[PDB]
């Protein structure tokens, strides 16, 4: 509705209005406009804007496009001083108002429509699990002589011998040692309930917040899942609030998958399950109480792993989460307790509530791009009836280590997933979802960013060759 | 209206008047006195002020001048302490109180006369589009010693390894990587909203606004076109805006075309229209929705461009943004895509709108004389029916490559400009706008000021010849 | 002598043999061979290596090329620790044995070869006199947030007011105010005297030395001239002899021609004269005691100076000295008197020490390049008999101001200087000297200095535009 719109612009004395978008890497990009440009052509045509500017998107000659404002998506900013109100919009092509091959937002859509048009179903729920951490200093550098990182939070455990101003009061989680210790050890939970309450002003429906695993600041803050495109937009939303809380409470958020080698990373498992007319069609007589449906989804999955990891682990940082560790969601099977599945089952009564979780993305993937990967995956998995096999029950990456334990793996390299994205694209291009340009400059952007990481020394080549 | 002033000054208790103008440069000059220093007579007959003291007026003997205050441009200083009441005044030579030759706001005037005189159209409109940086220090110097410039913002991206007081934050915009980020990444979201509001309470129509490309805070707000003359004079508010709102801040905002080598300029795209008894006469069934009256303008534009750029680039300082890049809007051509091309021609629905951009214009630029010199050049692409050629939809500056392609270009460096300025004067002395003294004097401002940066050693050339 | 240089390494019990030449921009380059592996071969056929490695030379596929050691050069280092033996090498190509095109040093001698073959003289007669500076420290760089130059020296006139560990003893020369004061004044006395007993143990013959007149350290030591070749190979070890006595003596010196901007920049005056079997074929009866040769000579220097300086003022530094001033040597003309025209004409007794002085060059100039080009314009000024016009006896380039003075001037900028050379490279290219692809080459080298310099925001930019 246009019309609950220009009421919220006289309700909440709207002074602006905040048009925002993600582009490819799925980074939410933003634009204003007074509340007074908002009319009746605003919702019917858009508003003009350059594509040529945003990474990935149109070239030197066709570069004018459209921002379409989805009505439904309006919410007032809880940070700006202005009363400003949130405006989500579509990237559409100029004429055709058709929506943009590129544009991250309308693909999801794409992949909602292609689901409901395939008959197998009429909805697909995402509850995704994005796991951050909160730091007070974080710096970093590269040029032709160096480079480095350096983290700092008051949790650290590194800090137990650092002097402070006012005395080291020291009651610090220890590495590995953030689940669950309650305050003073635990430093955030009145900034998690900020993030939380505030979660809510923006529609987002919280169910829990605690800290999580790693020294120095890890959260997590989880929310009530949703249908695939409204639950990227949650994400972002997620997102720009613990960004923006951190920064308000002096303190700095990273959603990067590993910022420190040797404590935890951060995740983003995603919960997944199809309905159509009220019922959940993952319930069923099958394993763990599924449907034979579920089963070819999760089989989908399995088969479009590593093309899949290209959107769901889209930095070469997301690799150094997913290495040979104990429970390191690195093994393609499914289980529903084997915790070296990169697909858990979740054991549950209601069979309202069956579904899926898919244990490898992390947060620093797509919203929009990595859910609909994950479903064309599983919708592709079901067309062709492809069976996953047995679960695994046994245990992970060592011992086994019998057979050598080759059995499925997610991607080990950036490159490799790019390059698997590549050839394993077929399930991405049914039904017009994505097209051959759209994922070819997806594959030039991480490319690019792959290179600067192959190609700069690293910290640790001179430890282990300076004195070659 | 002269009584809806007096109106004001008691409705507003304006305890003081700001007199505006303008100097040959560009730069917004001023002097204030009580307000009961405002009488009947003021209106009528100004007040008497020292010509000799501004740069390129008056000289030894003649230097008495007339301040005469336009009534139509009333508004509250909303930073002074003290109510106070700002009118923007013209200069007017003594007893003839005709309008002075060098003051830019008269020549600006005589030029949209002149568009009605010759009966073309009766309006000029022009919407320029200054852009801008927002910093935090910035520290320069030159002595016989040497010379040096520092910038510094908590957004430039070199500070990614700072060390800061409460811990680095560390969410800032890549180099050219500005263009959306939501905040933190944008750090500069009230502030721009408060330009706005304050730029709207001052009369202006506020479009839009949002972070520019350049890391370091680019930022820009873009405005609702007006008639020449009265745009013009809302360029000057809309950089006192900027520049005060800034200071507020804490930061120091500069309209510099390029002060970081390595990262965008600041541009002042202007689009351009004619109109007559409300029609527009720039539509039509000509190329992109053009009448053959805009393809004459254009032809006037592409003529004349080097003149222009004497008075659209100012600064030696402008040259070092229009370089053979790939953006640089240094091509002489026209197209409604190819961004190399310096004119550029927005595809938009309603003939109502239809207009021409030329890109190359610099916020350093003398809002008066720019604006002026590009309606002179148009007019006389006009009366002259100066054909365009054909548009260019290939590409810029590089690749071509394969004629050399010389095709038409603007001036390389602020010295040709002036040369270009000195030699094709006669389309701005039509109509007597432009008179050959007041010509004469510019260039002559600007000569001392090339000479500075063509004199005075500059750090590169020790890093190229120290060692020779 | 090949023997008499195997007869230096046992004299000497050399260890080393420190093989040199010169590359396009002027830089004396070099490599080192043991002692032992100086033999027959050695002389006959030179030793390999790679074209690839210098700017401006063997691009992608013809990288190998020969060294070849020119056996009259033979000298002993005077700095290195281990006893070393230096020999210049021209670059030959490889099977041809011929002289590389682009070798500066058989551009040289090839224009040497050429004067024989016209039959016009036997021998060119050069005597340069490098000018240069001598600083304690010199600190600059350039980034995307800024840039800067420092110098200093403990005579420095700013270093008046500075506080020194052992107390200031402020004996300093004022700006402009180094022509001659008596130690300790002149704090480089001692200096001048070791580079000028080094000179000459190197071959090199001095004829004076003496403070220059800048404060902060401008200093020269006068060599006796030599034939063309010989002193650019004399310029080379004077540069090499300041740079490392300097160096030695913890100071550094620069041939940079203008560093400080408000005080005198170095030049590279050059004296000329044409001799055939003994006698100076520049004596006559004609102006000042010239010939008509002379005369020729003279107008063939003037109407290539625009491309001379491409050569004898490389840099774009080297324009920051070329400038409107009252002493700046810009004035294309001759005189025996009048210090405003670039060419003096000495007025001395003895006819047989008749020559002229072509003021502009720098020391920045490749020694080479620089002569070679002063001597084919002056070769094409006789074959073509071009007449010089008559003598400039009145004033400089101010006041007259005359008729706007617009007589002849040399170029005003570097890009100017390389676009006549661009143009005007017939005369060059006269007997096969310089071909094509070496000029085309220098050209693109200085280009892309050039570039760095107006791409770069200069430091004065920023005190003249920041608050535009
Ligand atoms: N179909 C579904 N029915 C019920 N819950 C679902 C469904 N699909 C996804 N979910 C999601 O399961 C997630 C929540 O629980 P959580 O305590 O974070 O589990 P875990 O221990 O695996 O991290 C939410 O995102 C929830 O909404
Ligand atoms: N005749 C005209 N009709 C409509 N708009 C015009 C006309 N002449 C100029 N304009 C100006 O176009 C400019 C605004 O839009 P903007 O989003 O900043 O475009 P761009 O993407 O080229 O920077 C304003 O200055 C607008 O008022
Ligand atoms: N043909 C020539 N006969 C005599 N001296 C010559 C000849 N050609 C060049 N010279 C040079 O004149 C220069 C020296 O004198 P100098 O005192 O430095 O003069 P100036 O006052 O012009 O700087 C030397 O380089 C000297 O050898
Ligand atoms: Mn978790
Ligand atoms: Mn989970
Ligand atoms: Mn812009
Ligand atoms: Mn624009
Ligand atoms: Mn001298
Ligand atoms: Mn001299």
Known sequence: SAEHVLTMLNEHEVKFVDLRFTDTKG??????????????????????????????WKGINE?????????????????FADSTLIIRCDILEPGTLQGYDRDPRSIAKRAEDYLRATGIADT???????????????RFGASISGSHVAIDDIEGAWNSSTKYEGGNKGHRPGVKGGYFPVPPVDSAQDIRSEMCLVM??????????????????????????????????????????????????????????????????????????????????????????????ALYYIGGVIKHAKAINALANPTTNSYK????????????????????????????????????????????????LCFAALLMAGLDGIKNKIHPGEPMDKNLYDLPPEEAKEIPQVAGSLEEALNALDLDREFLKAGGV??????????????????????????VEFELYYSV
Do not use: W
């Open 27 to 56: 980074k939410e990009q933003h634009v204003t406009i007074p509340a007074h440009q908002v009319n009746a052509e605003f919702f019917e045509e858009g508003k003009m804007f350059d594509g040529s500017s945003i990474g990935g």
């Open 63 to 79: 570069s004018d496009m459209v921002l379409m404002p989805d009505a439904s998506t309006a919410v007032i900013d809880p940070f």
């Open 124 to 138: 697909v729920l995402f509850g995704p699990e994005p796991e951050f951490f909160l730091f007070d200093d974080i």
């Open 200 to 293: 809510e002003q923006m529609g987002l429906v919280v169910e829990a917040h605690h800290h999580e695993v790693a020294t120095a600041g890890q959260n997590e803050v989880a929310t009530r899942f949703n249908t695939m495109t409204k639950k990227a937009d949650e994400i972002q939303i997620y997102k720009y609030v613990v960004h923006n809380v951190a920064h308000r409470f002096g303190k700095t958020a990273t959603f990067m998958p590993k910022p420190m080698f040797g404590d935890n990373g951060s995740g983003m498992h995603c919960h997944m399950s199809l309905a159509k007319n009220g019922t959940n069609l993952f319930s069923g007589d099958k394993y763990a109480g599924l449907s034979e449906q």
């Open 321 to 368: 989460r997913l290495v040979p560790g104990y429970e390191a969601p690195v093994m393609l099977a499914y289980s529903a307790r084997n915790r070296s599945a990169s697909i858990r089952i979740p054991v549950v009564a209601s069979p309202k509530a069956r579904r899926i979780e898919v244990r490898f993305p992390d947060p620093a993937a797509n919203p929009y």
């Open 434 to 459: 994505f097209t051959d340009e759209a994922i070819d400059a997806y594959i030039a952007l991480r490319r690019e960013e792959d290179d600067r990481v192959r190609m700069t020394p690293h910290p």
